[PDB]
Amino acid sequence: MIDCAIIGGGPAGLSAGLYATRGGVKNAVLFEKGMPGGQITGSSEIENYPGVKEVVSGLDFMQPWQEQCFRFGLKHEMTAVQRVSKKDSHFVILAEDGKTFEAKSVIIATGGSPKRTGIKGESEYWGKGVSTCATCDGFFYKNKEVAVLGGGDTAVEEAIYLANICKKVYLIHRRDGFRCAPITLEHAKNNDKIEFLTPYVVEEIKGDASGVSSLSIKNTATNEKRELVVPGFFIFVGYDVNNAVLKQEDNSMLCKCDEYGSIVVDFSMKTNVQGLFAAGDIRIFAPKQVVCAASDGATAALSVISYLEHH
Amino acid sequence: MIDCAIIGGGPAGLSAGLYATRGGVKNAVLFEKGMPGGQITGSSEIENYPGVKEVVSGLDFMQPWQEQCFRFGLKHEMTAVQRVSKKDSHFVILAEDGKTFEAKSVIIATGGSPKRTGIKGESEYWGKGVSTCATCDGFFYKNKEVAVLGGGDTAVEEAIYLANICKKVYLIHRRDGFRCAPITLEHAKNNDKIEFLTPYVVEEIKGDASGVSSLSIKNTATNEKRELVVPGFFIFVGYDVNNAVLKQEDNSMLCKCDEYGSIVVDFSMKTNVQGLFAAGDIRIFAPKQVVCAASDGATAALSVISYLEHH
Ligand SMILES: Cc1cc2nc3c(=O)[nH]c(=O)nc-3n(C[C@H](O)[C@H](O)[C@H](O)COP(=O)(O)OP(=O)(O)OC[C@H]3O[C@@H](n4cnc5c(N)ncnc54)[C@H](O)[C@@H]3O)c2cc1C
Ligand SMILES: Cc1cc2nc3c(=O)[nH]c(=O)nc-3n(C[C@H](O)[C@H](O)[C@H](O)COP(=O)(O)OP(=O)(O)OC[C@H]3O[C@@H](n4cnc5c(N)ncnc54)[C@H](O)[C@@H]3O)c2cc1C
Ligand SMILES: NC(=O)c1ccc[n+]([C@@H]2O[C@H](COP(=O)([O-])OP(=O)(O)OC[C@H]3O[C@@H](n4cnc5c(N)ncnc54)[C@H](OP(=O)(O)O)[C@@H]3O)[C@@H](O)[C@H]2O)c1
Ligand SMILES: NC(=O)c1ccc[n+]([C@@H]2O[C@H](COP(=O)([O-])OP(=O)(O)OC[C@H]3O[C@@H](n4cnc5c(N)ncnc54)[C@H](OP(=O)(O)O)[C@@H]3O)[C@@H](O)[C@H]2O)c1
């Protein structure tokens, strides 16, 4: 059977594959439902991966990972995994096509999904002015004006963060009330670089081939419309980790997860199930950066190597 | 005063500097006693950093980090730091030459130090067949023979690791007795791909332009000398994390450390001291890889950014 099955081919899984195979794992298989690369391939520009000097698209950034991470014997399985289960001292991987695979160890590296809005223009402008990543994309708008959408802890915290980089932040939310921590709302309210736009909705994201240039917004109470001119629009309307593969036939989870469904790991990326590891945005307290996902992947692979030595 | 003082300019410190400054920290200073880059600059060949497909020396690998990590305003203070201390709500950085600097937050990124033997040829062939990093360099010797020096947990564990990649591992130690865990010695003694050479000392590491080619070894019970032909020599004769800057005037330690002196951190790279973070090989459970060190630096910088917003 497979020595290590890696579920997901974003930076976490790719790095895990590289490390596992270069660490002597003889039969490592990367399961990935599309082309490996993960979420960054949706972005028109990345500049914050340490050691990579030139600013390029996310797709171009991930291109060299394909040859490199497979250079040491990693195998690809292009399929959507439906379920990972533990059976005796190994794992059973069920694919959506009905195929089954068996593995001695497993690294879950399935990432997560920012919640989207379906606002007109969102799909076209995703990654070219529409972002869900303030750390990744904020600095591209240094001394420029941007808008933020949402009323939770993430939206308000990120508005505050962006206010220290951008000239001005328009915080757009569909009610006068917010569900973030009152203390955080207090801080945002007292920041002169944040302009609250409530109760508002965004009706259209406008731009051209080079990206976003304006938002059509509307006051929900008065129906007054306005065209807000900004090159960056940050959407923080929620988030869900991709933990579907953990769900067992009896509805339980494969391994321990937190309140939000993220996989609990220790510093070795070990779950509470022997031979099961996790890496990247799927795990608790993940920073949601490529370098961090890749580090988790490496760490999980090193833990797999140690586990397989004794098993 | 300085917003964030980053102590050490290896991949952890460099990545922290990049992230801190791209996150809007206006006055971030990287304290580094030499040229930034850290331990990888001793190696002649790196291939395992996810996303960098070219195989180049460690010095060349780190060259682009110099421009990139400083592109967003980071400053470099070229000095050896003697101590980091708390002073009311900020920190004082004391240099070995007596200069002092005040900072609002600090990231400790000082790495660690493998112990050197001083054996003839060790300096000459460092990073050219002499290594202290089995993950970094092991795979270069796939299906070749290598030697490992030392008799502790690290030497014997790494001999076992290398025996799963190499054709044969010679485990050389200056006594018949080992100080590793009993079960580890048992595993190694019963591994057919490990040959014990005890009690022996290595008198010289020999090579040519291509790197290491042989060792001169002496049996110290019989005084018999002979040549051992191997292209790779791994030295594991001890290790110390670089935690000297934590030691206070009153001999107390600045923050909580583990039994080996490594800094305790949470998943946000926070120590038990407010405004003090750590990153890289200095912190507990560090995998000792550039991508991991860089991930920690990024994470610590994100925590600095949040800290400074509230302070
Ligand atoms: C708009 C945008 C811009 C970004 N720009 C940057 C940036 O500038 N810098 C940066 O560091 N990061 C950037 N990122 C990437 C970000 O940091 C992510 O956090 C990172 O990609 C997470 O990596 P991961 O490997 O954990 O997960 P993901 O990237 O989500 O990868 C998971 C992979 O698993 C696959 N998968 C999931 N479920 C299954 C299944 N059941 N079976 C098979 N395959 C499965 C998915 O198809 C995907 O390829 C950006 C993200 C976005 C959305
Ligand atoms: C032989 C060898 C080969 C390697 N090759 C690879 C490889 O192929 N792949 C890989 O991923 N990694 C490689 N590395 C690097 C390795 O991964 C290290 O674990 C990594 O460099 C740790 O990074 P760090 O930033 O935590 O610490 P370090 O790299 O140790 O950097 C710490 C920096 O802090 C400075 N510093 C320390 N104390 C002070 C002070 N008091 N004042 C001022 N400055 C200070 C030091 O001068 C140093 O530059 C190699 C290491 C070795 C020894
Ligand atoms: N510091 C912390 O402890 C911390 C930090 C960040 C996140 N978290 C937690 O992590 C979880 C995630 O929260 P998070 O803010 O991502 O989001 P979360 O609280 O769900 O909030 C989502 C927000 O987006 C709004 N929204 C949803 N769909 C929308 C749409 N289609 N159009 C416009 N607005 C829309 C919601 O509006 P309504 O309010 O009108 O429904 C809500 O304000 C929460 O439990 C949060 O507390 C904690
Ligand atoms: N799994 C784990 O928990 C784990 C894993 C790794 C390390 N550790 C711990 O980390 C600490 C460091 O261990 P480590 O093995 O790096 O080193 P360590 O225990 O100091 O052992 C060093 C070894 O190198 C030998 N040596 C020292 N100087 C030498 C020289 N100049 N020439 C030849 N041989 C020399 C020593 O010989 P002598 O024996 O003759 O003095 C000893 O066998 C230890 O506490 C170890 O237990 C724990």
In short:
Chains A, B: It holds the Pfam family Pyr_redox_2. With 311 residues, chain A is an alpha/beta fold.
The coarse silhouette of chain A is elongated
CATH topology of the largest domain in chain A: FAD/NAD(P)-binding domain
Bound molecules: flavin-adenine dinucleotide, NADP nicotinamide-adenine-dinucleotide phosphate
Q: In the residues of chain A, how many domains can be counted?
A: 2
CATH architect. name of the largest domain in chain A? 3-Layer(bba) Sandwich
Query: What class, by secondary structure content of chain A?
Result: alpha/beta
Largest sheet of chain A: 7 strands, mixed
For CATH, the homologous superfamily of the largest domain in chain A is named as: FAD/NAD(P)-binding domain
* Radius of gyration of chain A using CA atoms only: 21 Å
Order of helices and strands of chain A: EHEHEEEEEHEHEHEHEEEEEEEH
Oligomer: homodimer
CATH secondary-structure class of the largest domain in chain A = Alpha Beta
**Number of helical segments with 4 or more residues of chain A:** 7
Q: Greatest interface and its residue counts?
A: A-B, 49 and 48 residues
What is the end-to-end distance of chain A?
13 Å
Number of separate strands of chain A: 17
Helix content of chain A: 10-25%
Strand content of chain A: 25-35%
Protein name (chains A, B): Thioredoxin reductase
Binding site for FAD (chains A, B): 31-39, 281-290
Main location (chains A, B): cytoplasm
EC number (chains A, B): 1.8.1.9
